[PDB]
Design a protein around this motif. Structure first.
Motif, short mmCIF file in Angstrom:
data_model
loop_
_atom_site.label_atom_id
_atom_site.label_comp_id
_atom_site.label_asym_id
_atom_site.label_seq_id
_atom_site.Cartn_x
_atom_site.Cartn_y
_atom_site.Cartn_z
N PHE C 19 0.84 -1.19 0.00
CA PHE C 19 0.00 0.00 0.00
C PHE C 19 0.87 1.24 0.00
O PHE C 19 0.57 2.23 -0.67
CB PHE C 19 -0.91 0.02 1.22
CG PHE C 19 -2.12 -0.83 1.10
CD1 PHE C 19 -3.37 -0.26 0.98
CD2 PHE C 19 -2.02 -2.21 1.14
CE1 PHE C 19 -4.49 -1.04 0.88
CE2 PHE C 19 -3.14 -2.99 1.04
CZ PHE C 19 -4.37 -2.41 0.91
N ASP C 20 1.96 1.19 0.75
CA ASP C 20 2.88 2.31 0.85
C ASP C 20 4.10 2.14 -0.04
O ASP C 20 5.22 2.50 0.37
CB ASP C 20 3.31 2.51 2.30
CG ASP C 20 3.75 3.92 2.58
OD1 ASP C 20 4.96 4.10 2.85
OD2 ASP C 20 2.91 4.83 2.49
N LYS C 21 3.93 1.56 -1.22
CA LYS C 21 5.01 1.61 -2.21
C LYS C 21 5.25 3.05 -2.61
O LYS C 21 6.39 3.50 -2.75
CB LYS C 21 4.65 0.74 -3.42
N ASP C 22 4.17 3.80 -2.76
CA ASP C 22 4.27 5.23 -2.96
C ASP C 22 4.72 5.89 -1.66
O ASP C 22 4.04 5.76 -0.63
CB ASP C 22 2.92 5.77 -3.41
CG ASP C 22 2.33 4.98 -4.56
OD1 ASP C 22 2.17 5.55 -5.66
OD2 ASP C 22 2.05 3.77 -4.37
N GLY C 23 5.87 6.54 -1.68
CA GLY C 23 6.38 7.21 -0.50
C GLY C 23 6.95 6.27 0.54
O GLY C 23 6.65 5.08 0.60
N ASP C 24 7.78 6.85 1.40
CA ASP C 24 8.44 6.11 2.47
C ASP C 24 7.62 6.13 3.75
O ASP C 24 7.40 5.09 4.37
CB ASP C 24 9.83 6.69 2.73
N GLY C 25 7.17 7.32 4.17
CA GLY C 25 6.25 7.42 5.28
C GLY C 25 4.89 6.91 4.87
O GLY C 25 4.59 6.77 3.69
N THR C 26 4.04 6.71 5.88
CA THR C 26 2.85 5.87 5.84
C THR C 26 1.71 6.33 4.93
O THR C 26 1.86 7.29 4.18
CB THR C 26 2.34 5.71 7.26
OG1 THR C 26 1.78 6.96 7.68
CG2 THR C 26 3.50 5.35 8.16
N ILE C 27 0.59 5.61 5.01
CA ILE C 27 -0.48 5.65 4.01
C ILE C 27 -1.09 7.05 3.94
O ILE C 27 -1.41 7.66 4.95
CB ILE C 27 -1.58 4.62 4.33
CG1 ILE C 27 -0.98 3.27 4.64
CG2 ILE C 27 -2.55 4.49 3.19
CD1 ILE C 27 -0.20 2.71 3.53
N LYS C 30 -4.18 8.61 -1.00
CA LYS C 30 -4.03 8.61 -2.44
C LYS C 30 -3.11 7.57 -2.86
O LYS C 30 -3.01 7.19 -4.03
CB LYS C 30 -3.56 9.99 -2.93
CG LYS C 30 -2.13 10.38 -2.55
CD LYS C 30 -1.18 10.31 -3.74
CE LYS C 30 0.22 10.79 -3.39
NZ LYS C 30 1.15 10.66 -4.54
N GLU C 31 -2.41 7.10 -1.83
CA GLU C 31 -1.56 5.92 -1.92
C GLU C 31 -2.38 4.65 -1.76
O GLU C 31 -1.95 3.58 -2.16
CB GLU C 31 -0.46 6.00 -0.86
CG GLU C 31 0.45 7.20 -1.09
CD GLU C 31 1.47 7.40 -0.01
OE1 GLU C 31 1.36 6.75 1.05
OE2 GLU C 31 2.40 8.21 -0.21
N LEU C 32 -3.57 4.77 -1.18
CA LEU C 32 -4.51 3.66 -1.23
C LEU C 32 -5.32 3.70 -2.51
O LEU C 32 -5.70 2.64 -3.01
CB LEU C 32 -5.42 3.69 -0.01
CG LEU C 32 -6.23 2.43 0.27
CD1 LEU C 32 -6.25 2.25 1.74
CD2 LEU C 32 -7.65 2.50 -0.22
CA LIG Z 1 3.14 8.18 2.20
#
Ligand SMILES: [Ca+2]
Ligand SMILES: [Ca+2]
Ligand SMILES: [Ca+2]
Ligand SMILES: [Ca+2]
Lengths: 612, 13, 148, 627, 67
Positions: C19-27, C30-32
């Motif tokens: 789910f968090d392939k986009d970005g390093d910090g969490t959900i 828009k990443e969902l």
């Molecule tokens: Ca993120």
């Protein structure tokens, strides 16, 4: 500088240019209140871009940003028509990256503004290569077909994506599905794309559009070994006749499998393909029954006729080598350097007997039996690729190297005769040990001798060479140490290391326990020899020679299954060799045609299976 | 193959 | 926290990175939507923020990896299995990342005494691997053990 | 007396002292009506303890006793501040044993009375050792971090447990998580402990606090092979650039992996570690792409240049051995003991030819080619450990023993010359069979010859030695029996056992079927020899020599997978050897730096992977979100 | 001498300065194939097969031997 190091820096330089502007930083962060305050006053030239050459619409589409895209399309709708400009990303517009992330609404908003659905993406990061992780082609319909998203694909046919459009390699969109990793989704995308196919086209159908090297998509699945896409292409080429209980009698089309009038046939491109999965097409249900019917009916007796024609030929060659014109020698051998023991020289030029005229008719068979090999093996060098031919080990492989090097040495001993050259013994003896070990080529026609002679090939390259590099290291260390301790010794009583060439030879012979351990019990051998010998008896003929039987004993059952389906790809590849070489008096066209059983002029083949 | 999993099933039992 | 499945956390840790392939910090919701559109689900706008503000406990609408374990403890409601193969899974695995892997399954046939080649142990995984990632899950290990 | 037998008696003597008092018996049995009647009248000095030195609060906390603890804390709250006093349990207070059993309310009741949350537990049963089953450190925050209980850990940060506190070995609490067996829980305890980390500290962050041997916690995971904790430390060192569909381009930090300016680098400590699981760090996704880029770009041609420089050197050495100064001998060999057949003695000191001046320039290459080996291999003895260097078999191993013993013997034959010593043939012939079988060291650069030359090492130690002990037993029994039956025989007609040294040699040669079976068909051999020979033909060269091919044939596929990931740890360990030895004219710094692509001065490395878009690994988690 | 030939210890008895009887060479080619091709190398095969069958049995038999 490597080319992987060039594109690594551009993809990092893109991140500096995104931090450079507040717009591109707000393009990827969706902060619309940092977007809207910017492009209201001093509406910038949005030609300011990253080092990839990508607009603010591209950055807002490379990330899943619906809102930041549409705000950049309202005040500037001309961003939708602009491509990227750097040399590895030439032609990637905003529609392509929106298709790639499967952003469904971003395709509609770009399609409502008239995005070019035929924009070719000719970047150096998009072409098919071993360096690029995905090959998707150029057109954005192809980008939607190879992501397994059916909604984007239906959205581009309604806006006029030409399905017959092919990229720089010639691949249409039905080709790039066959090169995909996810093989089960592209079969279902073949059914989606042929449902939008142009009805009653002037040219061929889309299942038959060739490549820029000549590969039909049905022909491409056999090259790449896409066995799942092979069975979905055989769905439209079978006609189920009846199902009499458990049985089913289908009738395969066999036009694009057999490929009667063509230079490079379908089966020639499958058995010669560099892919290891290419051999699996020769086990699918219309091809397995085809190449076995070509083998059992014609291919096996037309090989055994040829396998017995060659062993009769090689018997005639050695019989003309054993009888060879030798006369008694007159130069009193104990006078010149009495170590030598020659006593037959040659005949200059004399055939005047009766039991040598029957030898000249045998010799002439070997000269015309060698030049036939250099007439049937020389034109085959250039039509496969001159190194793909000598090293594919499915279509002959390292027997065409042997069969030509043999046939040259019969045409080399002919030059050694007719000129009275003295060294006739040198090219003849290489001609026998290459001529007889080329009878091993005809072992592929028999199940007893077929899979074993692949194992001799798989050990003499992969496993004998990794041992013989580790023994030329070792037996140079002990032949040098044996020439040291017996240089000061008397060569008349123990002459196993009289010279350094013989020391390299007698140390190689000791390792294989062929020659006995050099010991003369009536003299005192030097004590340094016995210490070096106990190590040579342990390192060479305890450890290394018995580790060889262990290692070859281990890498035999590792490739015992690989050698079995490599011989089944070898009886096919000698059939396709024999159907091409032998004249058409032999090999009538395989299959039952339909000119009398009226359904066309295609040549059909019937397969009746019993499914439980 | 399925033959290998029947040995790992056997060894815990 | 006290959900007590040490190997499912190593499954969820890979699952949370999906789910968090986009970005390093969490959900970031828009990443969902990025992973929901990857399945072609096409969720409506302002239904994502509702779908995350009903899992989020501590405001700040982004959901993080501790909060991710809260929801998956509530689902997969509860299983009281034999507990013996859950002990045997952790001794067949020697790196302890909760996946058996491609090579470690060959590392146990070599020790159990089976002459098994490299392709046939790869064939053992393909039968066992439902999600097809090449390493069998602990749940795939259970479904390949006691289900039959 | 063994040290395991000492602590076994103390843990039994603790049970006698518990039976000794009614208090400690009521401390562990929870019989509160035997507790309350005792400490109401004649309030004892509770300094009476077990032989471990433990108070009645310790015994009531070693067992899960909430009630018997709190009754002993009401009438005597000074029991909470007392440690154990025996030499293997020094410093274990009542908070430690309450933390260890995860008694949640017993931590609160001890914390309400001001228990010292920084009490070091310096007992001989708490230190890290191969004899102690668990290493948890010293501070009771560390005792709570390594039991996987998050509630005790949050309870000690609120009462002031200094998280940066390190034990006697130097390990902070983030080190002791990496040495844990349950590797998946300590990753989640790393996220808990860094959330309580001291904000804007003056010193370094807690992810970089070194050890008492110099190991950062990121450096400790590479030593112990904690591959799960390695990927959780690489979570804070990657920056995901973009996800263009299926691809993902991450950008690894590579500062603490490469470790440019440092004596003992990170990769030097991983490939030299004694743990067998240490080699698995060289297959993780930022390191696998790093040491292969160091190998394919520079490391493989800088090895092949070196591999071809040495085989050119050894050819020059043997060519200076084959040509060696031998003159004809004049001492009429059939006069002194005509068994001997010497006919070349030596030259005293004479190089006066033309075809030996070209030999002296070759000899001088061997002397300076030997001393270079004793200049590049001698300082490497002491920086690895002088026995860790000769026996790790990943970084050279049993080739540095060979390459030094060879190079000494070229510097030993130089002493045999220049002094006119007679035995020149002895150190030269050992120098060839050690000099040439050191070309085998350069087989590790090639995939064809790499994994095979590990198998020759894994058989010449593990498997040839277990056979050759079982043949020195056997062939001494038959060489003795062959010297017996041919001592009374004529050595002129059958001289294969004329002496007992030759009898030990001809029996060893018969076993390997090298020498033919000693038989002279024109004479009558003694019948006792043929009976001993049929047993020697069956025991030695039927059973034993063919069991050797069976046993080595069996222990080849057992370690065929072990030899494959041992060579991949060997191409890494020769890269880190070559990046350290070769000058910095060669090997530019691996990675793309960030001084021009502005995000810092750290040297970054990009890895772009293609993870599959399989729906089955996602659909289970988007359905738990939707429903 | 027939037991020694089978183990390839003694060389094959041949004197190239005399004419050996032709019946010996026919019996010898069978003895070179049945004994020292088939049987002696099947021994290494069979002992090579029944080594890993009892490699686990030999391991817990030595642990019962140190006890
Ligand atoms: Ca993120
Ligand atoms: Ca949150
Ligand atoms: Ca694993
Ligand atoms: Ca799995």
């Amino acid at each position: 500088q490597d080319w992987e190091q060039y594109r690594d820096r551009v993809n990092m330089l893109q991140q500096e240019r995104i931090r450079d502007s507040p717009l591109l930083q707000a393009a990827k962060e969706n902060d619309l209140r940092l977007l809207k305050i910017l492009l209201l006053n001093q509406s910038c030239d949005f030609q300011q871009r990253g080092a990839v050459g990508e607009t603010a619409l591209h950055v807002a589409a490379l990330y899943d940003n619906l809102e930041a895209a549409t705000l950049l399309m309202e005040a500037a709708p001309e961003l939708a028509k602009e491509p990227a400009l750097c040399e590895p990303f030439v032609g990637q517009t905003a529609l392509h990256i929106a298709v790639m992330n499967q952003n469904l609404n971003l395709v509609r908003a770009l399609l409502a503004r008239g995005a070019s659905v035929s924009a070719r993406a000719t970047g150096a990061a998009f072409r098919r290569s071993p360096h690029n992780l995905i090959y998707y082609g150029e057109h954005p319909l192809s980008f939607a077909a190879c992501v397994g998203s059916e909604e984007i694909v239906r959205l581009l046919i309604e806006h006029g994506a030409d399905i017959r459009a092919q990229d720089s390699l010639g691949n249409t969109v039905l080709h790039i599905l066959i090169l995909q990793p996810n093989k089960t989704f592209a079969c279902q995308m073949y059914n989606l794309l042929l449902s939008y196919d142009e009805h009653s086209d002037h040219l061929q159908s889309l299942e038959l559009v060739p490549n820029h090297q000549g590969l039909t998509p049905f022909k491409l699945a056999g090259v790449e070994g896409n066995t799942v896409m092979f069975q979905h292409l055989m769905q439209k080429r079978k006609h189920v006749q009846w199902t009499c209980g458990p049985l089913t009698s289908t009738l395969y089309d066999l036009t694009e499998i057999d490929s009667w009038g063509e230079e490079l046939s379908f089966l020639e491109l499958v058995v010669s393909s560099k892919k290891r999965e290419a051999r699996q097409i020769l086990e699918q249900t219309p091809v397995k029954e085809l190449v076995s019917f070509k083998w059992k009916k014609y291919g096996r007796p037309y090989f055994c006729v040829l396998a017995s024609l060659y062993i009769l030929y090689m018997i005639c060659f050695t019989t003309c080598c054993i009888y060879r014109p030798l006369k008694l020698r007159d130069d009193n051998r104990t006078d010149p350097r009495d170590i030598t023991i020659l006593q037959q020289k040659l005949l200059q030029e004399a055939y005047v007997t009766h039991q040598d005229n029957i030898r000249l008719v045998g010799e002439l068979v070997t000269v015309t039996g060698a030049v036939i090999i250099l007439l049937l093996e020389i034109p085959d060098i250039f039509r496969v690729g001159a190194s793909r031919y000598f090293g594919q080990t499915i279509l002959g492989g390292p027997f065409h190297v042997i069969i030509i090097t043999y046939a040259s040495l019969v045409l080399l001993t002919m030059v050694m005769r007719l000129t009275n050259m003295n060294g006739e013994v040198v090219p003849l003896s290489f001609a026998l040990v290459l001529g007889w070990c080329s009878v091993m080529y005809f072992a592929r026609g028999f199940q007893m001798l077929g899979p074993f002679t692949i194992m001799i090939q798989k050990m003499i390259f992969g496993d004998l060479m990794r041992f013989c590099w580790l023994m030329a290291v070792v037996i140079l260390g002990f032949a040098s140490a044996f020439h040291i301790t017996f240089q000061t010794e008397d060569p008349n009583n123990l002459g196993e290391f009289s010279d350094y060439p013989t020391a390299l030879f007698s140390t190689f012979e000791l390792f294989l326990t062929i020659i006995d351990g050099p010991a003369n019990y009536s003299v005192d051998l030097p004590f340094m020899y016995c210490i070096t010998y106990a190590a040579f008896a342990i390192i060479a003929t305890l450890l290394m020679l018995n580790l060889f039987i262990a290692m070859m004993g281990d890498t035999h059952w590792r490739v015992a299954q690989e050698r079995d389906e490599l011989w089944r790809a070898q009886v096919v590849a000698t059939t396709v060799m024999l159907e091409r070489k032998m004249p058409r008096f032999l090999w009538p066209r395989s299959g039952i045609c339909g000119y009398e059983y009226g359904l066309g002029d295609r040549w059909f083949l019937r397969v009746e299976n019993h499914h439980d | 193959s399925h033959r290998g999993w029947e040995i790992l099933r056997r060894n815990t039992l | 926290a006290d959900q007590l499945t040490e190997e499912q956390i190593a499954e969820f840790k890979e699952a949370f990175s999906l789910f968090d392939k986009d970005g390093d910090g969490t959900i970031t919701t828009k990443e969902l939507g990025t992973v929901m559109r990857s399945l072609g689900q096409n969720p409506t706008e302002a239904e994502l923020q509702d779908m995350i503000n009903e899992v989020d406990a501590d405001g700040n609408g982004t959901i993080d990896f501790p909060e991710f374990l809260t929801m998956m403890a509530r689902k997969m409601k509860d299983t009281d299995s034999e507990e013996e193969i859950r002990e045997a899974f952790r001794v067949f695995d020697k790196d302890g990342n909760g996946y058996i892997s491609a090579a470690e399954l060959r590392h146990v046939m070599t020790n159990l005494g089976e002459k098994l080649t490299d392709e046939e142990v790869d064939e053992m995984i393909r039968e066992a691997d439902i999600d097809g990632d090449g390493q069998v899950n602990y749940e795939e290990f259970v479904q390949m053990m006691t289900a039959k």
